């Protein structure tokens, strides 16, 4: 069903119970949990937090706890598939789903007893009507009409479940709830802002929707922080302040140096073509056109002279028109705690996203999840300040791979889609072994490529990438990303293609994750799969 | 655990099981209903609920009302600190949200 | 003792909050409270004001002695006098820690109150190690501490008394 | 000079961060500089509704708040008309907003919220009635420019200029209407009593529904339904002030329990928006003579108890819900004060005064006073009280 109001249908039912919270592993879901936690620790509601990572682990977790509890909450997992069968629950168990994935599965919408949805229906939803998809000679004369009905169903399904995308972030639904109860604070607002910024960082929403949501959140930010109109001189300096900024698109430039953050943002590392000596001088000219000494630009930003940084964020936006980069200022937020603590809402994201996906593994799958959930509260600024040295090490080991597959031309034009692959012998290729830290590498590879190639066909073909997962099982991981452009709707379509291709070839595949476009494939079924896929997409 | 009951000489176990029993005798004598277990409560109470996070496996922890709870590794609950004190002070659980 | 129990004894001081929920009189084993009328002041013990603030159910108020002007006179009176001068409340350190950490936005000029409190503390601790050195230096047998709060006592007591016992012993080992 | 209209519980418009209204329901603040204009709504009881933040695009300058809706109004410009905006947050349907434009060259000067209705006094000397859902009700003309407007239940409380005063005095009149199914004009523009050389500072109703108002000299007056609808002073906030520059800013009035909720202000007549001011609770004190004596003290307590329980009779006459226990406790409280005043007059050998006090007593209290008069050998007083008891029984 659809929950009409969150107060009297979701909260005030679980208010007196013992709930169990399943949590996916992505910054959006972490920030969507850390608000629900703070909304339970305020009303003394015994919960329990189980970090899951796939469908196998979610099933294993549901195996053990399914008799003690009889309430459940799933966060960013289990809204794009059917639920009453993969778990096979009892009758008196209730499920709440607060996922972003789209589109919501059909039966999960006409099942108004066990699977309630906390999804605001004013998103981009168009769910088919009820009976369009759900149930002597006259016998055959009418059962032929029912056969026609089934034939229409087989089509309208293919119409509705063909493109996957994402709606409003969870950490905004939860914040709407936490504002209804009148129990919202700044700490619950920063997590909303981060859980929103993360989607736009990982490029899962459109710029239009992102600016619409920023427009929403700014009213809240001003409602909280404007109440200090002229008393900003008699407010404690050690008390968080959130502010709206129109600030640059360079990644991590306030902790890195101004030079190492131009060479690594995968938006100026594409235009400037900072992988070919012929265009590296473009960066030099861009710096010289501003009067930035080549010795100050190489030093850390906090130590740069005070006479340069006056109007940096304007003399950079200007001198980027003269080079063909007009989208250089974005709209974000920033937080101050105390004397030296100043974060942009896209530094917290790159630090959290890299504490959870650190390459060197030190235990089970849920050992990093805990360390990343830890670094969102202000009492742990020693993990954040540490997860900013991984996020650096990663970003300097991505432009040294997109520099490989573009000074070697490993982007094959296999027909209707591009194609690439990786080699173990290349350094820093075991870092991207995880099936979650591979989507970002591919989505930056596409952005550099489309800007690099001279063709007109390749500039509008989706990419498909594979990199080896397990040497012992001899398997690789495969993704699929939409055709890139400036105003791409972001509605991927590979979750169906790979499914039908593995169905045709009848090979061994695993759709383990929650998103469908990531698969593990036998190293030998690569070509058997790929050829049938080429023919299928056509 | 028998990393300890292996280092005591075999007559110190009798001293132990005497001391422990006399202590449990005294404790139950304080009040009317089964006295007051003075073993717990080592630090002033700060809040009413606590948030723990398991660190080793443990068969099936109990809630007084018969509503058990499984304890897998790295899975955090929100329980009354009236029950978690016994286990935090040993090494099983952990108090995270300080 | 240890700081975490001085902090327990300090959560009995009375403060004034402004609730935003309806509740009728409560009969506590340590008195009575209420009634709680939304938008009207009421005086409660600290351990309840803090616990209600964390659950987003009230709005604290600064105690009267917690003013950025009277404090800027206490801070001078303390440095003038040459003895322990009387203080606003017997537990001012714990109040100005718990309050300013949990309700720093309901207190105007928190980061000046905080620095004045710390200035007073850093002096009342300097007078102690002078009053605890003349004691030994001259081998006294008594010392009248005037207005010491329990916290200053407890930060350097379990060392001072333990180093005076070893001195009484050394000073009375020749009688028999 | 005639004082300008105002919303009770508001701070002046020239402030960057001002109070639009502060009453017993909640607070409405308006932060307005040159960059942005925002309106924030807060409820004392969080269970009533969540905090509401609005982008004041139309520059609303008048506001009122109730348990039903939020009422906002703005004057006209050279391009836009004067608008009345209602945020019907308590509505059970999916339409929780409506706005209406006044005719050309008509500007809203004052608003107020009642139970299920809203009223707006305009520059055309018109009073426009609206249902809380947006239906236009009756319209009638005002006898003069409006000063302030308040509502409670079915009652409409209008204060306007009935004339022109001299030497600092205002000339104010009150029109009190009951807008139920049987329309009644309780006060046909009666003169509003004010302290000399004072202006109107605050009007409204007590939580129990009795009209009250405060002048600029700190005098709080309340309608005395038990005294022919006259106005009785129930407090003087200047008695709690220490200097000329100190003032009290009234927020609400409560009759049971008795409390005057106001904001103490040092240096001005209105409190600054930040930091959040603390609500003080002042006691009511009727201006009786020789209040330091036992007689004057008890006489003040008696008549304060009488006037602060007239609302129970009003709730009964209009079918509203009232607690019969509150009515019984009021009578017991008054009969005890009469009995103590009679014993005091008896000690002072003022036996005629005892009979006067017994006239205010119940039949049971008079019978008890007769036996108290037989005691202590007050034989003639006992006879006068007995004859009074006979007269009381004959009045039935």
Swiss-Prot record, chain A:
Residues found modified as Phosphotyrosine: 130
What interactions and quaternary structure are annotated? Component of the CMG helicase complex, a hexameric ring of related MCM2-7 subunits stabilized by CDC45 and the tetrameric GINS complex. Associated with ORC2. Interacts with HELB.
**UniProt effect for mutating residue 198 to G:** In MGORS7; decreased protein level
Recorded hits in PANTHER family, A to Z, give: CDC45-RELATED PROTEIN, CELL DIVISION CONTROL PROTEIN 45 HOMOLOG
Q: Which organism is it from?
A: Homo sapiens
What is the recorded function of this protein according to its Swiss-Prot or TrEMBL entry?
Required for initiation of chromosomal DNA replication. Core component of CDC45-MCM-GINS (CMG) helicase, the molecular machine that unwinds template DNA during replication, and around which the replisome is built.
Indicate the impact reported for residue 236 to Y.
Answer: In MGORS7; uncertain significance
Protein name (record): Cell division control protein 45 homolog
Q: Which Pfam family, any one of them, does this sequence belong to? A: CDC45
Q: Which domain of life is it from?
A: Eukaryota
Matching entries from InterPro entries are given as:
CDC45
Q: Name one GO biological process term.
A: mitotic DNA replication preinitiation complex assembly
Protein location: Nucleus; Chromosome
The annotated consequence of residue 68 to R reads: In MGORS7; decreased protein level
List, alphabetically, the GO terms of the cellular component aspect.
Answer: centrosome; ciliary basal body; CMG complex; DNA replication preinitiation complex; nucleoplasm; nucleus
Gene of this entry: CDC45
Q: One GO molecular function term? A: chromatin binding
Tissue expression pattern = Widely expressed, highest levels are found in adult testis and thymus and in fetal liver.
| Keywords for the protein's UniProt record, in alphabetical order | Cell cycle, Chromosome, Disease variant, DNA replication, Dwarfism, Nucleus, Phosphoprotein
Q: Which family does it belong to?
A: Belongs to the CDC45 family.
From Swiss-Prot, chain B:
Q: Per the record, what is the consequence of mutating residue 54 to Y?
A: In IMD55; lower GINS1 protein levels and defective DNA replication are observed in patient cells
UniProt keywords, alphabetically: Chromosome, Disease variant, DNA replication, Nucleus
Q: Where in the cell is it found?
A: Nucleus; Chromosome
Lineage: superkingdom: Eukaryota
Provide a GO CC annotation, any one: nucleoplasm
Signals that turn on the gene? Significantly up-regulated in aggressive melanomas.
Q: Name one GO biological process term.
A: DNA strand elongation involved in mitotic DNA replication
Q: Spell out the family assignment given in the record's similarity comment.
A: Belongs to the GINS1/PSF1 family.
Q: What clinical condition does the entry mention? A: Immunodeficiency 55: An autosomal recessive primary immunodeficiency characterized by chronic neutropenia, natural killer cell deficiency, recurrent viral and bacterial infections, and intrauterine growth retardation. Postnatal growth retardation is present in most patients.
Report the function annotation for this chain.
Required for correct functioning of the GINS complex, a complex that plays an essential role in the initiation of DNA replication, and progression of DNA replication forks. GINS complex is a core component of CDC45-MCM-GINS (CMG) helicase, the molecular machine that unwinds template DNA during replication, and around which the replisome is built.
Protein name in the entry: DNA replication complex GINS protein PSF1
Where does this protein come from, organism-wise? Homo sapiens (Human)
Q: Which residues of the full protein are shown?
A: 99 to 196 of 196
Curated annotation (Swiss-Prot), chain C:
Which residues does UniProt assign to the signal peptide?
A: none
The record's Gene Ontology cellular component field reads:
CMG complex; GINS complex; nucleoplasm; nucleus
Please give the SUPFAM superfamilies that the UniProt record associates with this protein: GINS helical bundle-like, PriA/YqbF domain
Main subcellular location: nucleus
Q: What's the subunit arrangement here?
A: Component of the GINS complex which is a heterotetramer of GINS1, GINS2, GINS3 and GINS4. Forms a stable subcomplex with GINS3. GINS complex interacts with DNA primase in vitro. Component of the CMG helicase complex, a hexameric ring of related MCM2-7 subunits stabilized by CDC45 and the tetrameric GINS complex.
PANTHER family, alphabetically?
DNA REPLICATION COMPLEX GINS PROTEIN PSF2
Name used for this protein in its record? DNA replication complex GINS protein PSF2
**What organism is recorded for this protein?**
Homo sapiens (Human)
Lineage of producing organism: Eukaryota, Metazoa, Chordata, Craniata, Vertebrata
User: What's the name of its gene?
Assistant: GINS2
From Swiss-Prot, chain D:
Keywords (alphabetical) are: Acetylation, DNA-binding, Isopeptide bond, Nucleus, Phosphoprotein, Repeat, Ubl conjugation, WD repeat
- Give me any GO biological process, just one: mitotic cell cycle
GO MF terms on file? chromatin binding; DNA binding
Sites of N6-acetyllysine modification: 244
Q: Where in the cell is it found?
A: Nucleus, Nucleoplasm
Q: List cellular component terms (GO).
A: cytoplasm; nuclear replication fork; nucleoplasm
Per the record, the major location class is nucleus
The answer to keyword Nucleus applying to this record is: yes
Complex formation: Trimer. Interacts with the polymerase alpha catalytic subunit POLA1. Interacts with MCM10. Interacts with DNA2. Interacts with CDC45 and GINS2 subunit of GINS complex; these interactions associate WDHD1 with the CMG helicase complex.
Briefly state the protein's biological role: Core replisome component that acts as a replication initiation factor. Binds directly to the CMG complex and functions as a hub to recruit additional proteins to the replication fork.
Could you tell me what this protein is called? WD repeat and HMG-box DNA-binding protein 1
Positions spanned in the full protein: 428 to 823 of 1129
